[PDB]
Ligand binder design. Structure first.
Ligand SMILES: O=C1CC[C@]2(CC(c3ccccc3[N+](=O)[O-])=NO2)C(=O)N1
Ligand SMILES: [Zn+2]
Length: 108
């Protein structure tokens, strides 16, 4: 009866990811970054996610991860901005960077 195994959208409950899918990119699953507007994000990297809607085509502009292009990842249910999908890189080619405090963790 694990209580901390699934991540859901904090706004609506959409199933998004799993603790088992956390990915230590450069040795840590947690990365703290700012966008050009100075907004701080505490980002968890996941090998896999579901329930998102990836918006538009990838961009390398101001990418926080060397060699990856990003696409905005909304909650596919409620449209909450949950993070980014990264692609175009190497080992791995793709991953998800999700904003920790926009998810809720709970039982399967
Ligand atoms: O890895 C990333 C993804 C999020 C982003 C990219 C970004 C941005 C940069 C240029 C144009 C538009 C956007 N946007 O997210 O809408 N703002 O924050 C950033 O700085 N780095
Ligand atoms: Zn949602």
């Amino acid at each position: 009866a694990p209580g901390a195994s699934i991540f859901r959208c904090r706004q609506c409950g959409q199933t998004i990811s799993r603790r088992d899918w956390l990915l230590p990119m450069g040795g840590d699953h947690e990365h703290v970054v700012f966008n050009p507007a100075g907004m701080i994000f505490r980002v968890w990297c996941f090998s896999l996610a579901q329930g998102l809607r990836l918006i538009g085509a990838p961009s390398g502009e101001f990418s926080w991860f060397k060699g990856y292009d990003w696409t905005i990842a909304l909650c596919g249910q409620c449209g909450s901005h949950l993070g980014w999908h990264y692609e175009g890189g190497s080992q791995p080619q793709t991953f998800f960077g999700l904003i920790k405090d926009r998810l809720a963790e709970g039982p399967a």
